[PDB]
Symmetry: C6
Subunit: 31 residues, 6 copies
């Protein structure tokens, strides 16, 4: 399946980038 897989892989990856950006926001607001 390109559904249970492939789409879900892109979702998971978007979440990973969400987490990276939120850490960069947290770091800036420590600043």
């Amino acid at each position: 399946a390109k559904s249970l897989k492939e789409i879900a892989k892109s979702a998971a990856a978007a979440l990973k980038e969400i987490a990276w950006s939120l850490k960069e926001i947290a770091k800036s607001l420590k600043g």
Copy 2:
């Protein structure tokens, strides 16, 4: 039922969420 349709819309939203948050992170680095 399929999830494929739904999971596609979710993934697309999460990519837009990712983009906006990178823009927020960039603005707060300014």
Copy 3:
């Protein structure tokens, strides 16, 4: 089993609202 379709639909709907608000937040911060 495939009522998870309907729950996942409501999740995806919330993610779309999240995405929209984040666009407005990014615009305000930019």
Copy 4:
């Protein structure tokens, strides 16, 4: 994959959390508008 009852109720609580997160983000967007 065995939902075995639970995964539907966990997925329900996830969806419920996302609805609350959407509400709070609307409030934050409002606050930041000024």
Copy 5:
């Protein structure tokens, strides 16, 4: 199966995280109100 019992643990961790996320966003919305 292994897997089923995995999604037992995983879906629970996700749900727990989303609850924390919702709560911190409430606190952030409160802080940005003033």
Copy 6:
């Protein structure tokens, strides 16, 4: 099926980091 589980695991791990970042952001915004 097994890999849907591994994707869901990656998502869950990212959501945990998102929660941790957000607690640091909430701490920074507290005053």
